[PDB]
Amino acid sequence: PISPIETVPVKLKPGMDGPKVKQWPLTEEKIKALVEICTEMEKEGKISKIGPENPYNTPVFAIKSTKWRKLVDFRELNKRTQDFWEVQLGIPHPAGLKKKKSVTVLDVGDAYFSVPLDEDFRKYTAFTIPSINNETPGIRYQYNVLPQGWKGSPAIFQSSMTKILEPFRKQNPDIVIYQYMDDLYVGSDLEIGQHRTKIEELRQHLLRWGLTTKEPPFLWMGYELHPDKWTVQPIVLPEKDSWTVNDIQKLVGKLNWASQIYPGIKVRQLCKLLRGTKALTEVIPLTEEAELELAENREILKEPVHGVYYDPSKDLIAEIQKQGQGQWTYQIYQEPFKNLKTGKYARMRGAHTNDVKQLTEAVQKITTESIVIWGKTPKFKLPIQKETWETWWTEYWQATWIPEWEFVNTPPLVKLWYQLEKEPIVGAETFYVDGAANRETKLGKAGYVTNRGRQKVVTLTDTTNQKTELQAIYLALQDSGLEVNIVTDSQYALGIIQAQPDQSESELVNQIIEQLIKKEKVYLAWVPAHKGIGGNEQVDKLV
Amino acid sequence: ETVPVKLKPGMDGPKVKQWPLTEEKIKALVEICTEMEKEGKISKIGPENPYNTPVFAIKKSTKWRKLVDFRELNKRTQDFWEVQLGIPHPAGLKKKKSVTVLDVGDAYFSVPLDEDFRKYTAFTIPSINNETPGIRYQYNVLPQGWKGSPAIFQSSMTKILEPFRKQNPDIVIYQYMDDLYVGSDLEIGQHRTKIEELRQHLLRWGLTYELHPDKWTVQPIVLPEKDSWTVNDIQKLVGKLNWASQIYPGIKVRQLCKLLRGTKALTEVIPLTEEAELELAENREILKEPVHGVYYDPSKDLIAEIQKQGQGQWTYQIYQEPFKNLKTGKYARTNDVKQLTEAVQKITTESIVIWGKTPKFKLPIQKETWETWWTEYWQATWIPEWEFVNTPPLVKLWYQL
Ligand SMILES: Cc1cc(/C=C/C#N)cc(C)c1N1CCC(=O)Nc2cnc(Nc3ccc(C#N)cc3)nc21
Secondary structure: OOOOOOOOOOOEOOOOOOOEOOOOOOOHHHHHHHHHHHHHHHHOOOEEEOOOOOOOEEOEEEEOOOOOEEEEOOHHHHHHEOOOOOOOOOOOOHHHOOOOOEEEEEEOOOOOOOOEOOOOOHHHHOEEEOOHHHOOOOEEEEEOEOOOOOOOHHHHHHHHHHHHHHHHHHOOOOOEEEEEOOEEEEEEOOOHHHHHHHHHHHHHHHHOOOOOOOOOOEEEOOEEEOOOOEEEOOOOOOOOOOOEHHHHHHHHHHHHHHOOOOOOOOOHHHHHHHOOOOOOOOEOOOOHHHHHHHHHHHHHOOOOOOEOOOOOOOOOEEEEEEOOOOOEEEEEEEEOOEEEEEEEEOOOOOOEEOHHHHHHHHHHHHHHHHHHHOOOOOEEEEOEOHHHHHHHHHHOOOEOOOOOEEEOOOOOOEOOOOOOOOOOOOOOEEEEEEEEEEOOOOEEEEEEEEOOOOEEEEEEOOOOHHHHHHHHHHHHHHOOOOEEEEEEOOHHHHHHHHOOOOEEOOHHHHHHHHHHHHOOEEEEEEOOOOOOOOHHHHHHHOO | OOOOOOOOOOOOOOEOOOOOOOHHHHHHHHHHHHHHHHOOOEEEOOOOOOOEOOEEEEOOOOOOEEEEOOHHHHHHOHHHHHHHOOOOOOOOOOOOOEEEEEEOHHHHHHOEOOOOOHHHHOEEEOOHHHOOOOEEEEEOEOOOOOOHHHHHHHHHHHHHHHHHHHHOOOOEEEEEOOEEEEEEOOOHHHHHHHHHHHHHHHHOOOOOOEEOHHHOOOOOOOOOOOOOOEHHHHHHHHHHHHHHOOOOOOOOOHHHHOOOOOOOOOOOEOOOOHHHHHHHHHHHHHHHOOOOOOOOOOOOOOEEEEEEOOOOEEEEEEEOOOOOEEEEEEEEOOOHHHHHHHHHHHHHHHHHHHHOOOOEEEEOEOHHHHHHHHHHOOOOOOOOOEEEOOOOHHHHHHOOO
């Protein structure tokens, strides 16, 4: 059938005309098949033959297993068709789904060919079956239904099905139906008798619109759906002696996927191997830490884990745990500890960061996910003391706000690992540091002078103004006692260090951090350079 | 009869993805939008419309309102609403003693929108967990939030306001987007009475917050007053002055700098020379007075920066060329994102009153944090443009009070 529904007006892009690609000549078996196929389609209404007035043409092919498929190459018509509203904005996530008592799935056969094409647009879908050795005119046809391979077909189909279903939905809100491509999945909380009664009204409501039409484990979209739980579809980690780049990329992918429900999956040590430019076929020996992570992953996957579905009447609880190395892991549940979903956060927003900054940005990411999946933020449980956090975000310059949360003692806990003094330290040595770099030679001198008369100038190769100014601070921290005042003219270095970094990609910065943790008091001050600020000009001299 | 609205040459409509919304806000919009559909102000659209602008609910009042982010559409019609049919901005509004802001957005629903333009006004109410397809709509009437709306309505507006202006020639009435700014020099009780009469005039046409811009004074860069002076205090003073030197012409520093001559311990109290006290004096006079040689340019975007100062206080500058500050202010007094969101609205309002433009904001916050939360406190009906930045740590203290 061809649905009686109204058609969707289609137009080409402004200033553009429909296609006129020439029909490559075909072998005689190919065109014979195309003649067989096009007369079956013509009799069912899917196509119609046309006069040679129509100047439009799109090439057609055929390929074969022992029966033949018609393939129309809509590349040029697609390039000239208007853009459409994108078909889906996102996939429903299992953890957002409600528990259902009875689920059956139904598949639309003849999906696109059951939906009419805008009569004003059919002229451009014209194609031509050529003659044998392209002697005589060929048989010209056009589509009356949505052709497969045209860029409007997914949009207009899914839209047609929404208009068709919206009566039955409003006359039956309790029932849920999911449209994806040809698929109709239908769920309800009715008893398996009265439920199969409602599926028939749906079928009969479908056939009145020209759409003719299973077991608990529905393998869908990578997931395994059951009526009362979900999980990821089975994860098999290969047992290889040699790992290729392509093997590890696929493993990182399955693990990333498995981490939606399997808590605590770690992948960093596996990802570290992919860094480099090596070919897909090259074998990478597993490092010691990578084979340690593969071990923990194999164990986490040992016994099946499932996820539960969402009860809209209950709060969501999100728990986060630090796994070190900037890897975070989280679980969302409504009754402890029956998880709706798990995940991991391991990004690096910036070059230098601290656990408090990392934990906040993991909170934001879980929060956005929550609004997508359930439409509300969860109540958080965080491995950070309420006062560690109050300390940090009131003194820090960026704004923040994490929603309702509670401390939960699941070590490791998030700490600030040092605190810069707010006032200069009396009876502590004042270092006036400074770094510089001649920008053609790429040589630099990092140095300091002291109010107690000490001086020092080390020389660096392979450096920049930025790196030397951090070397000069590193020096002052090496050579000083537990308490120390430092005066730099590098806003660069002051910005990094006043952020209380925890970790960095710069092992220089990491050395400075290990110094600042060992100290007991450190005051850091900035003066402008070349303004002649006492000590500043003298270590500027020495450099 | 509709006014044909055309986009800038060779520009397409907005294709801006809808941000995720919470259950309570999706429910609010679904009520609002079925009601507007009955009344015919919007109509469902099909997949042949590829355009989208995002939509949100605010609460300004105890009733959800609908807010459409037309920032992208406004950028793409900007020839139309600014040069071809611009509303002139009166220089007198910033002088008036009282300014009341009134919402007249509901006027735009009277007016049909050019039938060949309604496709660019498309928006989607989305679905929790994407379980259902988005409800899609387009406007038929002049939409609130679109800068084309006041442009098209300005002929009808001056007709509505014609009697009231004739009878109160000392009252300034400026229209920006969905708001009427009404400025008078009257005593506050007389002022409110005049606003009450003006609501009556509007009320005869389907049209049902008090600023004192006179009391908007610049927040000058403040130099500490002190008994003793450590070298740390003078260093922080030279740094704060030398940077102020880049804005205010005439700041001098070198007399201070020779109080710091050797490599002195930071905590040692340095005696002040009397030419130093002479110079802190001379500098304070400059920093109190407005910047010399900085003028608004109607052709250049306004920039606003905001620095968090801790303890619920925030500083801000408005400028078109960095360090040429047209305006510097503070804003004060719970929640960092709530306060910033209040600060942006305040600075935008002042920016509409003073220039007829909203500034582009440099926000000191994580983009994800901001986009998550700003709707929860946003109560204006426009939206300014914004970037996200990392506040230069020195700048923070150079504007501290
Ligand atoms: C019904 C369905 C099916 C699929 C795929 C099936 C395959 N393959 C995908 C979605 C998104 C839904 N949808 C329909 C849309 C809607 O609006 N709401 C929904 C609410 N709750 C559920 N839960 C649920 C519980 C248990 C099972 C099982 N077994 C399946 C589903 N499903 C919903």
